[PDB]
Amino acid sequence: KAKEIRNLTTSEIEEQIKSSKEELFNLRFQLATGQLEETARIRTVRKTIARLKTVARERE
Template sequence: MTVKEIREKSNAELLNDIETLKAELFNLRFQQATGQLTNPARMREIKKSIARIKTVMTERELSNQD
């Protein structure tokens, strides 16, 4: 998910995306623990996507405070 795509979404959609990504990350961690993980790079992608979403949300909050 690119920053441009993230900026086009509303805060409610972003919160929903974060919850979905966290659930997927949990499942991937579970697969890693049991030795069934097929694409370990996906974990890194998900973590970065969550960080990007949180960064955009923080920027929005700070711009609204001014």
Template sequence: MTKATDIRTKSADELNEQLLQLKKEQFNLRFQRASGQLENTARVREVRRDIARIKTILGERTRSAQPAS
């Protein structure tokens, strides 16, 4: 699990790279769960929430960079 404070210290490129890795992991976990090979079921939840954290922080950055209209 990644802390939001750790995510905020990273650049946008690093966050996009981490987001891509997490989405790949989520894809693999989904297949493992479907085939009955998934041992750590809590990891699915952790990955989903880490993806949400990264997307939230990236969204905050884009909204704060845009002028209010």
């Protein structure tokens, strides 16, 4: 239900960098050491990346 591709294509590639590298990567470290609660936050960021890539390939 929550779509995050209302923006243009210029700021779009900036979101795939911020969502994956600074957000999805940090949550995997805190899970390994045993410091992260709210484990459902991982599946949310995984879909935010996929929704961004679907619209990018769709615009062609």
